[PDB]
A paper describes a structure:
The serine/threonine kinase CK2, a member of the CMGC branch within the superfamily of eukaryotic protein kinases (EPKs), is a heterotetrametric holoenzyme consisting of a central dimer of non-catalytic subunits (CK2β) to which two separate catalytic subunits (CK2α or CK2α’ encoded in Homo sapiens by the genes CSNK2A1 or CSNK2A2, respectively) are attached. Unlike many other EPKs—in particular its closest relatives within the CMGC family—, CK2 it is constitutively active in the sense that it does not require a phosphorylation or any other posttranslational modification for activation; alternatively, salt- and polycation-dependent self-interactions of CK2α2β2 holoenzyme complexes were proposed as a regulatory mechanism and experimental evidence of such interactions in the cell was provided. CK2 is involved in important cellular processes such as pro-survival signaling, cell proliferation and DNA-damage repair. From these substrates as well as from peptide studies, the consensus sequence S/T-D/E-X-D/E for CK2 substrate recognition was derived.
A frequent OCNDS mutation is the exchange of Lys198 to Arg at the center of CK2α′s P+1 loop, a key element of substrate recognition. In CK2α, Lys198 plus two further basic residues (Arg191 and Arg195) impart a positively charged character to the P+1 loop fitting to the enzyme’s preference for a negatively charged side chain one position downstream from the phosphorylated substrate residue. The structure of CK2αLys198Arg was solved by molecular replacement and refined to a resolution of 1.77 Å. The asymmetric unit of the tetragonal CK2αLys198Arg crystal contains two protein molecules. While their C-terminal segments were not visible in the electron density, both CK2αLys198Arg chains were largely well defined from residue 2 to 333 and in particular in the region of the P+1 loop, which contains the mutated position 198. During structure refinement, a number of large and approximately tetrahedrally formed pieces of electron density emerged at positively charged surface areas of the enzyme molecules known to be relevant for substrate recognition. We filled them with sulfate ions because of the relatively high sulfate content in the crystallization solution (200 mM) and the absence of alternative anionic candidates. In the context of this study, two sulfate ions located at the “central substrate-recognition region” are particularly relevant because their binding sites are the P+1 loop, which harbors the critical Lys198Arg mutation, and the activation loop. At these two cavities, sulfate ions have been found several times before; in a recent high-resolution structure of a CK2α1–335/heparin complex, one of them—the P+1 loop site—even harbors a sulfo moiety of a heparin disulfo-glucosamine residue.
Author numbering: 2 to 333
The structure:
């Protein structure tokens, strides 16, 4: 008798009800643009999976961002393309503008809309309490959309949230690790940064769903309101769960493991130990108290649950009192 199966609480069957081609990305045929339309201007950064450049589309003098892909299986490229195309036009989702291939090297490049990003290592030091609520709400719009479209981002973290603070514009980017949710499908648990991995990934529970993104969002929120980046700073996959357990407690952890009949890696037995569930007040100090409020802590608590089924959905999260003033302002 192995682990208890799990199904997404919401948006469970959205992909089943769509045509096969919506989610069957291995069959996707890429529509290629003209690489000569783009002249690279300057290098913007290096990623795990790509080199990122600023470019100009010389056919319309539009500034774009070009991610030249490092070698990866074509099906992973098809997946990212299919997901980006499925989500195009969705709220706060980065827009894929073109897909080109260098005719000599055969290296593919994804061409995106440009976003005048403010560096989060300089932005987060200036964000107000209202700013955090505002941008969290904007992230939730993107997550509710992609979840409703049958897609888990699986790499929610500050580096994948581009913010043009001057225009109060937000884009959730870097969909190369996202996947389609299918009920009963088992997924890879080692895909994104450990600091934002939900406990289900850390205990190798593979039948997870959209709620993994909600854990990651909670980790982001904690780091923003407490000014501690990353919040759960584990040394490895095992230590990561210890860091969580020292805050959320081991009792809720073992209850979760028992409920889903999860076989815990023998390493965890020694290192997890016994820990009380702590109060969030212990992370509040004079440098971050202007960002911490009862509503922030209530919201954070409802995201950071071991049991993925008990975390707020993106839509429930948007109804939380933490966002009341944001919702009122956006309505006028
Ligand atoms: Cl959701």
């Amino acid at each position: 008798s192995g682990p208890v199966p799990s199904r997404a609480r919401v948006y469970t069957d959205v992909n089943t009800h769509r045509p096969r081609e919506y989610w069957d990305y291995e069959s996707h045929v890429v529509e290629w643009g003209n690489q000569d339309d783009y002249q690279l201007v300057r290098k913007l950064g290096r990623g795990k999976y790509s080199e990122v450049f600023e470019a100009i589309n010389i056919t319309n003098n539009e500034k774009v961002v070009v991610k030249i892909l490092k070698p990866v299986k074509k099906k992973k490229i098809k997946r990212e393309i299919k997901i980006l195309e499925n989500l195009r036009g969705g709220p706060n989702i980065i827009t894929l503008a073109d897909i080109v291939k260098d005719p000599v090297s055969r290296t593919p490049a994804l061409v995106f809309e440009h976003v005048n990003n403010t560096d989060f290592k300089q932005l987060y030091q200036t964000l107000t309490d209202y700013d955090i609520r505002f941008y969290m709400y904007e992230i939730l719009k993107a997550l509710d959309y992609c979840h409703s479209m049958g897609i888990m981002h699986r790499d929610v973290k500050p580096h994948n949230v581009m913010i043009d603070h001057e225009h109060r514009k937000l884009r959730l980017i870097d969909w190369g690790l996202a996947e389609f949710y299918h009920p009963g499908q088992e997924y890879n648990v080692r895909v994104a940064s450990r600091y934002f991995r939900g406990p289900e990934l850390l205990v190798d529970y593979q039948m997870y769903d959209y709620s993994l993104d909600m854990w990651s969002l909670g980790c982001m929120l904690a780091s923003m309101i407490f000014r501690k980046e990353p919040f759960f700073h584990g040394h490895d996959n095992y230590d990561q769960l210890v860091r969580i357990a020292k805050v959320l407690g081991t009792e809720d952890l073992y209850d979760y493991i028992d409920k889903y009949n999860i076989e815990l890696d023998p390493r965890f037995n020694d290192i997890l130990g016994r820990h009380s569930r702590k109060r969030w007040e212990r992370f509040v100090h004079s440098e971050n108290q202007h960002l911490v409020s009862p509503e922030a802590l209530d919201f954070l608590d409802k995201l950071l649950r071991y049991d993925h089924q008990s975390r707020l959905t993106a839509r429930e999260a948007m109804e939380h009192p933490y966002f009341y003033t944001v919702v009122k302002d956006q309505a006028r």
